[PDB]
Structure 1
């Protein structure tokens, strides 16, 4: 139904596409990137991380074709030159990683979009939503530049409000052992971040993250209670959040675990999941959910300090969320 256009057909841009391939409620009609249609078609069809695209992929001049549907390929390095209105695009997915400041994202509105979704933490955005935590706070007539936050945050928010609603978080620290992304370097090179300037596939890399405190944007009640860091390791995909929290109540591992298992099958069904199996990162490559609790890992100390570990496919889970936000936003009418 709703027509979508993607700006930056990259790891998140093509996976959002693959995700949207299914959902007939939305319709990807155009993509924009610095590459040629012939390159974008190849990278869309063969993925080193998720395999082959099961669909018919081809080029019609300078236009993509996938299962009959022809997709428009644009190449404006400047969003203002996009002409969304012309082609009739309603919602635009801003996944270049270059336009997360309102000042660059709003161009899409001026060019004729109705709404804009930023697949990363934005600046001066109208609102930040984590499907499962605050999508209910989306005002159609007031919010147009929308941020879907970061993958880590989408992973941590769901199980944080659940421990908070039932036991109440006093404070907590989080680490994310995360897979390397295209923002790091193959071999040693310059990066605004001297950590990320180091060969990504050779070391464990300490780095910062805004995910933990940015949780207060979706769950205000937790403002100033969390903080955290990250560590990039030698795997191309899949991450795991590690949270240690000081609880307001005395629990047992069996209590902390039943809570999450309840919400995962209840309120949070489809976004939050639960597992009692001893799985490893490769096992989660393809997981469309945001957060998967590893029950075998839950621990409690003195009945008041808890450790909850949760998995998350940083490209797929996150890619299915962008598409879920698109449809939600859409259903509220543009």
Structure 2
């Protein structure tokens, strides 16, 4: 029903597409990138990480035909010339990675879109939402440039929430051991981040993350209580959050895991998951939840310091959240 347009048909853009084909509440009517339709059809069809799209994809002139519906292909470098309004696009998913500051993202609104979901942390957005955490704070009257935060924040927030509500976080530090992404380099090339300049598939690469601090945007009570870093490693998809926290109450592993399982089975079902199996990163490829607790890794010291580890498919989970947010937003009235 709600008409969606995707700006930047890359890892997240094409994964959102894939997640959207499942949602009957949403309809992707157009995509914009920097290439032609033949190239997009080919990239959409064959995915190195996710396998063949199971849908008939063809090219009809300048457009994509997927299961008989035509999808408009644009190739406009400048968001202002998109003309979203002319084709009836209501919600734009901004997934280029170039327009995360309000000045650029709002161009879509000026082009006739009713709402914009930035697929990353933003600057000056109306509101930053983590589904299952603070979607209730969205005001349809006032919020038009919406950030869906990062994949890492989507992983950490749901369980930080649980731990905080339940035991109370004094302070905590995280490490995300993260698959490489298109922001890195194949072989030692210039980068703003000198760590991210280095061959992506050959090293463990420390890099900064704003994800722990960003939790404070969706869970105000944690402002100034978490910090963290990332470690980019030689895998193409799937990541994991390692959080070490000092709690207010004294707990046991059993207690910590019970609260997490409860939430995964209740309030956070479909967002937070819980696993007691000894799995590895490849096992989570294709996982649509935001966070899956590795129960076997939970660990406590002195009743107060806990280690919690949670898996996330950084392309899939995050893309399903983008679609969830689009439906929720549309559900509040456009």
TM-score of the pair, normalised by structure 1: 1.00
Match in the other structure for 2:37:
37
Shift of 1:327: 0.1
Shift of 1:306: 0.1
Shift of 1:193: 0.5
Shift of 1:183: 0.2
Shift of 1:8: 0.3
Q: How far apart are the structure 2 equivalents of 1:81 and 1:24?
A: 29
Q: How far apart are the structure 2 equivalents of 1:250 and 1:85?
A: 56
- 1:140-182 Cα distance to aligned partner (Å, 9 max, x none): 0000000000000000000001000000000000000000000
SS in 2 for 1:140: coil
Q: How far apart are the structure 2 equivalents of 1:85 and 1:310?
A: 41
Shift of 1:248: 0.1
SS in 2 for 1:5: strand
Shift of 1:303: 0.5
- 1:33-83 Cα distance to aligned partner (Å, 9 max, x none): 001100000000000000000001000001000001100000110000000
Shift of 1:277: 0.2
Shift of 1:314: 0.1
Match in the other structure for 1:78:
78
Shift of 1:233: 0.3
Shift of 1:254: 0.3
Q: How far apart are the structure 2 equivalents of 1:312 and 1:26?
A: 24
Q: How far apart are the structure 2 equivalents of 1:17 and 1:35?
A: 17
Moved over 4 A (4+): none
- 1:182-217 Cα distance to aligned partner (Å, 9 max, x none): 000001100000000000000000000000000000
Q: How far apart are the structure 2 equivalents of 1:126 and 1:309?
A: 31
SS in 2 for 1:236: coil
Shift of 1:285: 0.1
TM-score of the pair, normalised by structure 2: 1.00
Q: How far apart are the structure 2 equivalents of 1:166 and 1:304?
A: 13
Q: How far apart are the structure 1 equivalents of 2:49 and 2:269?
A: 26
- 1:111-160 Cα distance to aligned partner (Å, 9 max, x none): 00000000000000000000010000000000000000000000000000
Shift of 1:108: 0.1
Q: How far apart are the structure 1 equivalents of 2:197 and 2:213?
A: 25
**Residues 241-252 of structure 1: pairs in structure 2 closer than 5 A:** 241-252=241-252
Match in the other structure for 2:327:
327
Q: How far apart are the structure 2 equivalents of 1:132 and 1:281?
A: 24
SS in 2 for 1:22: coil
SS in 1 for 2:211: coil
Q: How far apart are the structure 2 equivalents of 1:145 and 1:233?
A: 32
Q: How far apart are the structure 1 equivalents of 2:166 and 2:160?
A: 10
Q: How far apart are the structure 1 equivalents of 2:225 and 2:116?
A: 30
Match in the other structure for 2:240:
240
Shift of 1:85: 0.6
SS in 1 for 2:175: strand
In the alignment, structure 2 segments of 5+ residues that lack a partner are none
Shift of 1:287: 0.2
CA RMSD of aligned residues (A): 0.3
SS in 1 for 2:321: helix
Q: How many residue pairs end up in the alignment?
A: 334
Shift of 1:250: 0.3
Q: How far apart are the structure 1 equivalents of 2:237 and 2:88?
A: 34
Shift of 1:221: 0.2
Match in the other structure for 2:111:
111
Shift of 1:266: 0.3
Shift of 1:319: 0.3
Shift of 1:289: 0.2
Q: How far apart are the structure 1 equivalents of 2:143 and 2:90?
A: 14
Q: How far apart are the structure 1 equivalents of 2:35 and 2:13?
A: 13
Q: How far apart are the structure 1 equivalents of 2:69 and 2:21?
A: 11
Match in the other structure for 2:91:
91
Q: How far apart are the structure 1 equivalents of 2:173 and 2:149?
A: 19
Q: How far apart are the structure 2 equivalents of 1:329 and 1:77?
A: 27
Shift of 1:110: 0.3
